[PDB]
From Swiss-Prot, chain A:
The chain holds residues 253 to 302 of 1407 of the full protein. This is DNA-directed RNA polymerase subunit beta'. The RNAP catalytic core consists of 2 alpha, 1 beta, 1 beta' and 1 omega subunit. When a sigma factor is associated with the core the holoenzyme is formed, which can initiate transcription. Belongs to the RNA polymerase beta' chain family. Coiled coil: none annotated. It comes from the Bacteria.
From Swiss-Prot, chain B:
The keyword Transcription applies. It comes from Escherichia coli (strain K12). It comes from the Bacteria. A motif (Interaction with polymerase core subunit RpoC) lies at residues 195-198. Belongs to the sigma-70 factor family. RpoD/SigA subfamily. The gene is rpoD. It is found in: Cytoplasm. Contains 4 domains, connected by flexible linkers. In the active conformation, the domains are in an extended conformation, each making extensive interactions with the RNA polymerase catalytic core. In the autoinhibited state, sigma-70 factor domain-1 packs closely together with sigma-70 factor domains-2 and -4, contrary to the extended conformation that is seen when the protein is part of the RNA polymerase holoenzyme. Residues 179-237 are annotated as: Sigma-70 factor domain-2. One of its GO terms (cellular component) is cytosolic DNA-directed RNA polymerase complex. This is RNA polymerase sigma factor RpoD. One of its GO terms (biological process) is regulation of DNA-templated transcription initiation. The chain holds residues 118 to 445 of 613 of the full protein. Interacts transiently with the RNA polymerase catalytic core formed by RpoA, RpoB, RpoC and RpoZ (2 alpha, 1 beta, 1 beta' and 1 omega subunit) to form the RNA polymerase holoenzyme that can initiate transcription. Identified in a complex containing RpoD, the RNA polymerase subunits RpoA, RpoB and RpoZ, CRP and DNA. Interacts with Rsd; this prevents interaction with the RNA polymerase catalytic core and with promoter DNA, and as a consequence, promotes transcription from promoters that require alternative sigma factors. GO terms for molecular function: DNA binding; sigma factor activity. Keywords: Cytoplasm, DNA-binding, Sigma factor, Transcription, Transcription regulation.
DNA sequence: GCCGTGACTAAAGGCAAAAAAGCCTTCTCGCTAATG
RNA sequence: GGCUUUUUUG
DNA sequence: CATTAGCGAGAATTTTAGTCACGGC
């Protein structure tokens, strides 16, 4: 919903969805290049948390 | 020093596997490849397969060929394990077995279709009434026998070969994963020159697994090449 | 409706963390071990095979690597929601029903 | 060795109305505007 | 127009 | 006339019920 001025009011759901999609895309790009397994563990765990 | 253990594991896996331009090296293989067949067709069998397997390791052509041989011998153990798990789901699953008896029963019989017959001898009321599953047990054996025959090598030696090649691969991967994780501080320091930080360590594994003991340019500086390769052209990628 | 393709399988929370755990009772392990398995900080085997490891046994880093150098490819062990999905898919239903 | 036991944890706690306020991540730089 | 925080009526 | 922020756009307590681990004869 747009309030007065250039700012746009944000809802909680959009922020969480943005976080999840950002982490998913990061893990996708990082996995395509066969990154070391230590990194992918932390990324997978944090995606689980998200 | 750590790379020496990796090379030893590679040698062990090579021993397990082996148990004109591309023909000059193959000449060393074929100098006794046909000479070993009659000697092992009957001591000297081991003595000469040692020489047959050692020349294959003298010159390394392509690691992809080694991987090809690895999966070629892996499909055999894969179907052996498939038969094992099929027998397990026949017996232990629908029965209430402790699964310990197969060390006494299955591991000593293999081709012998008598271990399931002997299961009645030691009680096991579930094995007392094998009946339908007994037919269901040894009917899959009528696959295992000709599988073993077409393999041409004994089951116990198959398991031993798989164990030693697995030991070699496990040691190699253990060394790799136990000395890659300690090389992150240098990656951070060089990448400071977060996506850039991660592309600093994407080449870390390459420069680490490429580092040999016949080298002697500093491993930090030896990796500098590949971490700066990320900054060289792919920084804008 | 919109859909997002997860980079890897990911486990649901509700069926895990109700007062009775659905997956916990289906698989018959305590709730504590399942969360550790999902969070990748505790190694777990999914198929012991011919070795001396239970199919549904919980391990750790040192135990797994020690078993890895002893057996390795003989036994199969994977982590996380991927392993959980694999062991669910490998576990049939009607046979367990008749066993119970 | 199984039921008793205690220790640990999830879940809800009134209805409607009004009146106010104040917010919706934070770090970084090139040409435009703020500044001297 | 959502949330948060107060104050008030019954 | 000369110097510099800057932001636009982008990016990184009470009460109750239930369950689970220890333990007691």
């Amino acid at each position: 919903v747009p309030l007065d001025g250039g700012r746009f009011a944000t809802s909680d759901l959009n922020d969480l969805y943005r976080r999840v999609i950002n982490r998913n895309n990061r893990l996708k790009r990082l996995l395509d290049l066969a990154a070391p397994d230590i990194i992918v563990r932390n990324e997978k765990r944090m995606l689980q948390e998200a | 020093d750590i790379a020496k253990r990796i090379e030893d594991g590679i040698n062990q896996v090579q021993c397990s596997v082996a148990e004109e331009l591309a023909r000059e090296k193959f000449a060393e293989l074929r100098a006794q490849y046909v000479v070993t067949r009659d000697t092992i067709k009957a001591a000297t069998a081991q003595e000469e397969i040692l020489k047959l397997s050692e020349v294959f390791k003298q010159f390394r052509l392509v690691p992809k060929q080694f991987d090809y041989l690895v999966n070629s011998m892996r499909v055999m153990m894969d179907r052996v394990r498939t038969q094992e798990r099929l027998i397990m789901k026949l017996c232990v699953e629908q029965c209430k077995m402790p699964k310990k008896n197969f060390i006494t029963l299955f591991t000593g019989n293999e081709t012998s279709d008598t271990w399931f017959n002997a299961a009645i001898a030691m009680n096991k009321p579930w094995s007392e009434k094998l009946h339908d599953v007994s037919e269901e047990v040894h009917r899959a054996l009528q696959k295992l026998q000709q599988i073993e025959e077409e393999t041409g090598l004994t089951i116990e030696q198959v398991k031993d070969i798989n164990r030693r090649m697995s030991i070699g691969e496990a040691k190699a991967r253990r060394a790799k994963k136990e000395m890659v994780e300690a090389n992150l501080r240098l990656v951070i320091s060089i990448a400071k020159k977060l996506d850039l930080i991660q592309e600093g360590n994407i080449g870390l594994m390459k420069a680490v697994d490429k580092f040999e003991y016949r080298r002697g340019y500093k491993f930090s500086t030896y990796a500098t090449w590949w971490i700066r390769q990320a900054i060289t052209r792919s920084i804008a990628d | 409706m919109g859909h997002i393709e997860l980079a890897s399988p990911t486990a649901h929370i509700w069926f895990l963390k109700s007062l009775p755990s659905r997956i916990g009772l289906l698989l018959d392990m305590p709730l504590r071990d399942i969360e550790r398995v999902l969070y990748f900080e505790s190694y777990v085997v999914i198929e012991g095979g011919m070795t001396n490891l239970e199919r549904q046994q919980i391990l750790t880093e040192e135990q797994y690597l020690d078993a890895l150098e002893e057996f390795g490819d003989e036994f199969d062990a994977k982590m996380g929601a991927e392993a959980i999905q694999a062991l669910l898919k490998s576990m049939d239903l009607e046979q367990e029903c008749e066993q119970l």
